Design a protein around this motif. Structure first.
Motif, PDB file in Angstrom:
ATOM      1  N   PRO D 175      55.441  40.820  48.261  1.00 14.30           N
ATOM      2  CA  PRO D 175      54.790  40.519  49.526  1.00 14.30           C
ATOM      3  C   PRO D 175      53.660  39.522  49.344  1.00 14.30           C
ATOM      4  O   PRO D 175      52.827  39.668  48.463  1.00 14.30           O
ATOM      5  N   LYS D 176      53.646  38.488  50.172  1.00 16.64           N
ATOM      6  CA  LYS D 176      52.647  37.446  50.029  1.00 16.64           C
ATOM      7  C   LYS D 176      51.299  37.922  50.519  1.00 16.64           C
ATOM      8  O   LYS D 176      51.209  38.649  51.500  1.00 16.64           O
ATOM      9  N   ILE D 177      50.238  37.468  49.856  1.00 18.77           N
ATOM     10  CA  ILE D 177      48.885  37.849  50.218  1.00 18.77           C
ATOM     11  C   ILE D 177      48.080  36.613  50.571  1.00 18.77           C
ATOM     12  O   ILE D 177      48.499  35.486  50.331  1.00 18.77           O
ATOM     13  N   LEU D 178      46.913  36.834  51.167  1.00 19.60           N
ATOM     14  CA  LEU D 178      46.079  35.719  51.594  1.00 19.60           C
ATOM     15  C   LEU D 178      45.391  35.080  50.409  1.00 19.60           C
ATOM     16  O   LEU D 178      44.759  35.755  49.608  1.00 19.60           O
ATOM     17  N   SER D 179      45.473  33.761  50.324  1.00 22.30           N
ATOM     18  CA  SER D 179      44.976  33.080  49.139  1.00 22.30           C
ATOM     19  C   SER D 179      43.469  33.065  49.087  1.00 22.30           C
ATOM     20  O   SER D 179      42.890  32.938  48.010  1.00 22.30           O
ATOM     21  N   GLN D 180      42.810  33.158  50.233  1.00 22.66           N
ATOM     22  CA  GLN D 180      41.358  33.255  50.214  1.00 22.66           C
ATOM     23  C   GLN D 180      40.901  34.622  49.742  1.00 22.66           C
ATOM     24  O   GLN D 180      39.785  34.769  49.243  1.00 22.66           O
ATOM     25  N   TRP D 181      41.730  35.637  49.905  1.00 21.52           N
ATOM     26  CA  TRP D 181      41.384  36.980  49.491  1.00 21.52           C
ATOM     27  C   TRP D 181      42.172  37.415  48.275  1.00 21.52           C
ATOM     28  O   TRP D 181      42.622  38.555  48.206  1.00 21.52           O
ATOM     29  N   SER D 182      42.362  36.517  47.321  1.00 21.54           N
ATOM     30  CA  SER D 182      43.260  36.800  46.215  1.00 21.54           C
ATOM     31  C   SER D 182      42.563  37.530  45.083  1.00 21.54           C
ATOM     32  O   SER D 182      43.209  37.937  44.118  1.00 21.54           O
ATOM     33  N   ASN D 183      41.240  37.637  45.136  1.00 25.93           N
ATOM     34  CA  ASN D 183      40.529  38.453  44.161  1.00 25.93           C
ATOM     35  C   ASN D 183      40.371  39.876  44.640  1.00 25.93           C
ATOM     36  O   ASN D 183      39.645  40.656  44.028  1.00 25.93           O
ATOM     37  N   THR D 184      40.976  40.202  45.770  1.00 29.37           N
ATOM     38  CA  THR D 184      40.850  41.525  46.352  1.00 29.37           C
ATOM     39  C   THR D 184      41.778  42.499  45.672  1.00 29.37           C
ATOM     40  O   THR D 184      41.601  43.712  45.768  1.00 29.37           O
ATOM     41  N   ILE D 185      42.791  41.972  45.003  1.00 27.21           N
ATOM     42  CA  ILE D 185      43.933  42.710  44.462  1.00 27.21           C
ATOM     43  C   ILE D 185      43.461  43.606  43.324  1.00 27.21           C
ATOM     44  O   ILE D 185      42.433  43.303  42.692  1.00 27.21           O
ATOM     45  N   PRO D 186      44.069  44.771  43.091  1.00 25.71           N
ATOM     46  CA  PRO D 186      43.736  45.534  41.888  1.00 25.71           C
ATOM     47  C   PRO D 186      44.188  44.800  40.649  1.00 25.71           C
ATOM     48  O   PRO D 186      45.215  44.129  40.657  1.00 25.71           O
ATOM     49  N   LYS D 187      43.390  44.910  39.595  1.00 23.98           N
ATOM     50  CA  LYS D 187      43.532  44.005  38.469  1.00 23.98           C
ATOM     51  C   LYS D 187      44.793  44.280  37.681  1.00 23.98           C
ATOM     52  O   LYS D 187      45.517  43.350  37.320  1.00 23.98           O
ATOM     53  N   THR D 188      45.074  45.538  37.393  1.00 21.79           N
ATOM     54  CA  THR D 188      46.218  45.893  36.577  1.00 21.79           C
ATOM     55  C   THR D 188      47.137  46.800  37.362  1.00 21.79           C
ATOM     56  O   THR D 188      46.677  47.705  38.055  1.00 21.79           O
ATOM     57  N   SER D 189      48.435  46.595  37.209  1.00 21.33           N
ATOM     58  CA  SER D 189      49.397  47.478  37.839  1.00 21.33           C
ATOM     59  C   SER D 189      49.439  48.813  37.114  1.00 21.33           C
ATOM     60  O   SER D 189      48.902  48.962  36.023  1.00 21.33           O
ATOM     61  N   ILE D 190      50.061  49.808  37.747  1.00 25.43           N
ATOM     62  CA  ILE D 190      50.046  51.150  37.178  1.00 25.43           C
ATOM     63  C   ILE D 190      50.976  51.249  35.985  1.00 25.43           C
ATOM     64  O   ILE D 190      50.561  51.689  34.918  1.00 25.43           O
ATOM     65  N   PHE D 191      52.220  50.820  36.112  1.00 23.38           N
ATOM     66  CA  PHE D 191      53.177  50.968  35.033  1.00 23.38           C
ATOM     67  C   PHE D 191      53.389  49.658  34.309  1.00 23.38           C
ATOM     68  O   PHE D 191      53.131  48.585  34.833  1.00 23.38           O
ATOM     69  N   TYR D 192      53.880  49.765  33.098  1.00 20.28           N
ATOM     70  CA  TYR D 192      54.142  48.618  32.261  1.00 20.28           C
ATOM     71  C   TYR D 192      55.531  48.111  32.580  1.00 20.28           C
ATOM     72  O   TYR D 192      56.519  48.673  32.121  1.00 20.28           O
ATOM     73  N   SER D 193      55.624  47.050  33.345  1.00 18.36           N
ATOM     74  CA  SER D 193      56.913  46.507  33.712  1.00 18.36           C
ATOM     75  C   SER D 193      57.199  45.305  32.839  1.00 18.36           C
ATOM     76  O   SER D 193      56.475  44.312  32.895  1.00 18.36           O
ATOM     77  N   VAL D 194      58.248  45.397  32.032  1.00 13.87           N
ATOM     78  CA  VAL D 194      58.626  44.274  31.192  1.00 13.87           C
ATOM     79  C   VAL D 194      59.200  43.177  32.074  1.00 13.87           C
ATOM     80  O   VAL D 194      59.711  43.448  33.170  1.00 13.87           O
ATOM     81  N   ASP D 195      59.031  41.928  31.635  1.00 11.13           N
ATOM     82  CA  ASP D 195      59.492  40.706  32.311  1.00 11.13           C
ATOM     83  C   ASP D 195      58.955  40.554  33.733  1.00 11.13           C
ATOM     84  O   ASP D 195      57.875  40.003  33.936  1.00 11.13           O
TER      85      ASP D 195
END
Ligand code: ZN
Lengths: 24, 133, 136, 195, 75, 71, 124, 91
Positions: D175-195
């Motif tokens: 899902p696309k997010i707003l580029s002005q608010w792109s530091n709003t995102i949580p830094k690391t995802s929960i699970f380790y997804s390869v590739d």
RNA sequence: AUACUUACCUUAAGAUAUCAGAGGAAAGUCCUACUGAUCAAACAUGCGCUUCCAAUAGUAGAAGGACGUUAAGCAUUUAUCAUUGAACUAUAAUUGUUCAUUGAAGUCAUUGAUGCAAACUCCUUGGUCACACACACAUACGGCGCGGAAGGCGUG
RNA sequence: UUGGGGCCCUUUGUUUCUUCUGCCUGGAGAAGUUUGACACCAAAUUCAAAUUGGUGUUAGGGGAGCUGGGGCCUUUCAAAA
RNA sequence: UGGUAUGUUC
């Protein structure tokens, strides 16, 4: 550039809790 | 026969017939005269304009006294009863509240009602000719 | 069907009907404020519509379109009946409402990015095929 | 006579054939398109003020404004507002041409897909898309574009594509997010997804 | 090949094929007869005309029928 | 003056409402500049009784002429 | 509202008209254009009609009659002149007569400049 | 005259017209004439007592039209301009 | 842009204020930087002309909307036709009533439609101008501040 | 030239005549004003620039001259009595 | 003696 961009995120470093495949 | 005196009325209605009818709407809404436009108003020279005591209004365009107007009623008592209708709550015409009080001098039509209850006219016209001096 | 993860296309239909038919424009704010809380796949688009549609507000009375009068005065300390110089007071108001939208976006972005990353990335087939088809 | 106020050009005695030939002309059609593009642009960006009828502030009003404070005004420079109003107009244009088309991607293998989503086989606008194509008189543009057209027929059954999942699909796009608010995102995802 | 309606009325004349003429309604009769001559304005003259209410109606002989009224000319 | 643009409706079945109530469906064979129309094998839709082998309709009485075929 | 005594339908461009048709329906809108057959073009004309249920309150006998009027909104319509029955004027134009004059002189200037330019451009 | 030319401007745009019988029709305007004959395509047709149907094309004789409603942008068409100057027509 | 190729066209006429008087090329025609009278248009310019132009001494109001909410408001009223079988009432071919079957059409609605009425919320619009916070008036009311809008009438 | 008071800044692209510099402890600076300039729209060459085709903008107030009109006054001339 | 339209060449 465009106001909509795909999100990008850091990996959580792979212990046994963050492994999605772990079955034990 | 005692005429009330009104300050703080709006001075932009202009035509007297339009001014009297708009005022009289703000006095008693859904009056007979106010809700039928293009009725003649009574001219009552020395027919109540409105029931509950209202006999005439009298305004002038004289640049001394713009906003002031004088309502004359049937009898001395209705003049005091009209203040009672406000009950210490100010009546408002358009967006301005109308301070009101009994006049320092009774109305001319009120004098005609009390005198019938022309020499007076002689005196008044001689007063007018003296004031023309 | 309004809470579907892919239900953004429905809300586009509802908003274009509102914006053509309605003369008053309060209904657009009242629908779009609800859309702002649903964790849709295309949630950002309606945040961008709200941000543009806030940015085009041209005086104080328009802010009663957004919410109520008492909530603005009590929660955000904006007086709509402020009489005075109204330029910088309006710029301050728009800065405050853009902040409260930023926090609501931050909540919904967490919801949507969680649902996508765990679950909806993984489902590939969303439709009935035939009684003889198998699923992985 | 006939005069085309779009093209600003007179012609000789109008016959329905000559006039109908003019109105589908290429030069005429680009000029007419430009005309209504400019008028729609104008009825958007007309920047003109209502009259301001300014009332004398009451004294009871003017005390309470003396309390509060002056509030600071932010004003950009000339070059700054030149850049930022270019950017804002660009954002409104690309947010206007944005359309949500996910549900056509999700149903891409379903059994009755060609009849509902191809839009050339529909029963309501199937004939109209056929009529809409063009005379297509310059085929040099058609030979210059060397793609295959790759039309979907209406006669498809579910026997083709039995198992959709055998490498044929790609994942859903994030899902696309707003580029002005792109530091709003949580830094690391929960699970380790390869590739 | 196109047959314009002047040509169809003229063929009704030339073969004498018997026509039923529907007048427009709220009058409520029909004229049966044979077309002897027709106008530019679609006035027609009818030989051995019958009028019928809306098949027992009266005979008229030969009439001139004003074309403002006529709705169908059918055979 | 100018002939109506019905060159595309020739030899196709067509339903038109004569006056305001009658509805006649036939094959369009010819047309005039008054929008007179002559159509073969007409029928009056209500059971519906056929008119005759060849009919003409005065276009004063035609309102609308939608086409029940390909065009 | 007072209308000039010698004001024909060519003067009343951009006024707001009140067109009455044969079926009892009133069309209200800014007048854009007219023709030999008297068929108008109205900018924001809104159709009104009296329903058959409200109609018997109009018949001759409260003080004032109150007629709920079924109105539809249509926009930039052209009427047909055969149906028009009479027209009345409802509202004056937006711009004043002086301000309308100013706009017309301006537009004449700009148009003359543009055709002067188009001529000198076709010469080179 | 201008109104008939405005109807010629609206070709290929969804117009809505009400006939004198009472019917309403809304569809693309394919062709129109100086007589006001109009041919609507992909037309949604509402009968006088209210039933709606779908017609592929219709030809209405323009004598029967009450009004036509064209798109709203056409108020900016250049045939409404009062002050306008021509390029001196050729031989 | 040029040029070349085709394809489609290449036209309803007439007129420019009226009436009267003098002159020029017995009836009429034409004309007169000729002359009267009427009319019409533009532009100046006036009328004691007529109507209209929003609180701040205050938190208002006027005009017009809402394709706005309360709202499923409150009160009425509507939701097929033919054929066949079965029970059924009955003065009755079975008119009435109920159940099923075949065929034919069939705008959506019934939270609708229609009748009535009220509160509330909100949009657009305006000189939110200047001097005043004033005892007037029978010939009833200095219409004796500057503008603006719209008409009526008059003159050049 | 400097200071003080009042009101206004929604002028929302912070004076909206244009460009360029610029601003809230401020209301400012430079250049320009119609066969010209400026803003914006559309394309395709395979970003931008390029060009061709379009739609607009070029304003508000005050003054000097020059000039059209009215009202009132003076002088002079002629006819109406 | 023309107009609009079309497509090719440079
Ligand atoms: Zn053209």
């Amino acid at each position: 550039m465009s106001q909509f961009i795909y999100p990008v995120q850091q990996q959580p470093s792979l212990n046994h809790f963050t492994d999605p495949n772990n079955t034990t | 026969m005692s005429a009330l005196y009104f300050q703080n009325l709006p001075s932009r209605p202009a035509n007297k017939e339009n001014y009297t009818r708009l005022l009289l709407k703000h006095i008693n809404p859904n009056n007979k005269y106010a809700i039928n436009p293009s009725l003649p108003l009574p001219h009552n020279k020395l027919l109540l304009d409105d029931q509950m005591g209202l006999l005439e209004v009298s305004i002038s365009r004289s640049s001394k006294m713009t906003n002031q107007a004088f309502l004359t009623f049937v009898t001395q008592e209705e003049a005091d009863r009209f203040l009672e209708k406000y009950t210490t709550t100010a009546l408002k015409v358009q967006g301005r509240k109308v301070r009101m009080g009994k006049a320092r001098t009774n109305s001319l039509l009120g004098l005609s009602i009390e005198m019938q209850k022309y020499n007076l006219d002689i005196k008044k016209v001689l007063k007018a000719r003296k004031l023309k001096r | 069907v309004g809470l579907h993860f892919f239900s953004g296309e429905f809300w586009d239909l509802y908003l274009e009907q509102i914006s053509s038919r309605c003369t008053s424009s309060k209904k657009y704010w009242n629908v779009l404020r609800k859309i702002l809380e649903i964790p849709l796949h295309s949630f950002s688009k309606f945040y961008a519509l709200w941000l543009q549609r806030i940015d085009d507000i041209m005086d104080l009375k328009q802010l009663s379109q957004l919410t109520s009068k008492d909530e603005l005065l009590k929660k955000l300390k904006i007086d709509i009946n402020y009489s005075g110089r109204k330029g910088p007071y309006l710029q301050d108001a728009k800065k405050k409402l853009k902040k409260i939208t930023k926090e609501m976006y931050m909540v919904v972005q967490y919801q949507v990015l969680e649902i996508y990353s765990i679950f909806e990335s993984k489902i590939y087939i969303n439709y009935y095929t035939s009684p003889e088809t198998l699923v992985s | 006579r006939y005069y085309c106020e779009y093209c600003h050009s007179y012609l000789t005695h109008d016959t329905l054939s000559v006039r109908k030939s003019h109105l589908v002309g290429k030069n005429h059609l680009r000029i007419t398109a430009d005309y209504y593009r400019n008028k729609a642009r104008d009825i958007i960006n007309k920047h003109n003020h209502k009259r301001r009828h300014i009332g004398k502030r009451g004294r009871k009003e003017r005390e309470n404004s003396s309390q509060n404070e002056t509030l600071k005004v932010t004003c950009l420079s000339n070059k700054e507002k030149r850049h930022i109003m270019h950017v804002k107009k660009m954002n409104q244009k690309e947010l206007a041409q944005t359309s949500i088309d996910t549900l056509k991607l999700l149903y891409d293998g379903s059994p009755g897909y060609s009849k509902v989503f191809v839009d050339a086989n529909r029963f309501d606008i199937g004939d109209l898309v056929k009529a809409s194509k063009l005379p297509q008189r310059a085929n040099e543009k058609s030979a210059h574009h060397s793609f295959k057209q790759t039309s979907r027929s209406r006669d498809e059954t579910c026997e083709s594509n039995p198992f959709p999942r055998l490498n044929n699909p790609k994942k859903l796009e994030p899902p696309k997010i707003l580029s002005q608010w792109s530091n709003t995102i949580p830094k690391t995802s929960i699970f380790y997804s390869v590739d | 090949a196109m047959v314009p309606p002047i040509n169809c009325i003229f063929n009704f004349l030339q073969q004498q094929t018997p026509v039923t003429i529907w007048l427009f309604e709220q009058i409520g009769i029909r004229i049966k007869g044979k077309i002897v001559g027709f106008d530019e304005f679609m006035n027609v003259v009818i030989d051995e005309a019958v009028e019928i209410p809306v098949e027992k109606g009266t005979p008229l002989g030969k009439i001139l029928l004003k074309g403002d009224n006529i709705t169908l000319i059918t055979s | 003056v100018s002939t109506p643009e019905l060159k595309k409706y020739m030899d196709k079945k067509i339903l038109l409402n004569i006056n305001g109530s009658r509805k006649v469906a036939g094959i369009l064979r010819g047309y005039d500049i008054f929008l007179n129309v002559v159509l073969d094998d007409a029928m009056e839709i209500n059971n519906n009784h056929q008119l005759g082998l060849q009919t003409v309709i005065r276009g004063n009485s035609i309102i609308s002429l939608e086409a029940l075929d390909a065009i | 509202i007072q209308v000039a005594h010698s004001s024909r339908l060519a003067n009343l461009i951009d006024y707001k008209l009140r067109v009455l048709t044969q079926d009892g329906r009133v069309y209200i809108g800014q007048l854009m254009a007219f023709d030999k057959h008297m068929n108008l073009v109205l900018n924001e004309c809104i159709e009104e009609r009296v329903p058959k249920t409200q109609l018997d309150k109009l018949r001759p006998r409260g003080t004032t009659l109150n007629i709920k009027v079924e109105k539809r909104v249509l926009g930039l319509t052209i009427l047909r002149g055969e149906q028009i029955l009479s027209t009345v004027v409802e509202d004056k134009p937006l711009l004043s007569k002086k301000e309308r004059l100013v706009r017309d002189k301006k537009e004449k200037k700009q148009a003359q400049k543009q055709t002067k330019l188009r001529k000198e451009k076709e010469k080179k | 005259g201008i109104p008939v030319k405005l109807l010629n401007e609206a070709q290929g745009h969804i117009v809505s017209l009400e006939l004198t019988t009472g019917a309403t029709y809304r569809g693309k305007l394919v062709e129109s004439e100086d007589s006001m004959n109009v041919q609507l395509r992909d037309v949604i047709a509402t009968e006088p007592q209210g039933a709606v149907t779908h017609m592929d094309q219709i030809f209405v004789r323009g004598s029967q039209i009450k009004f036509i409603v064209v798109p709203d942008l056409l108020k900016n068409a250049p045939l409404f301009k009062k002050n306008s100057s021509r390029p001196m027509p050729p031989i």
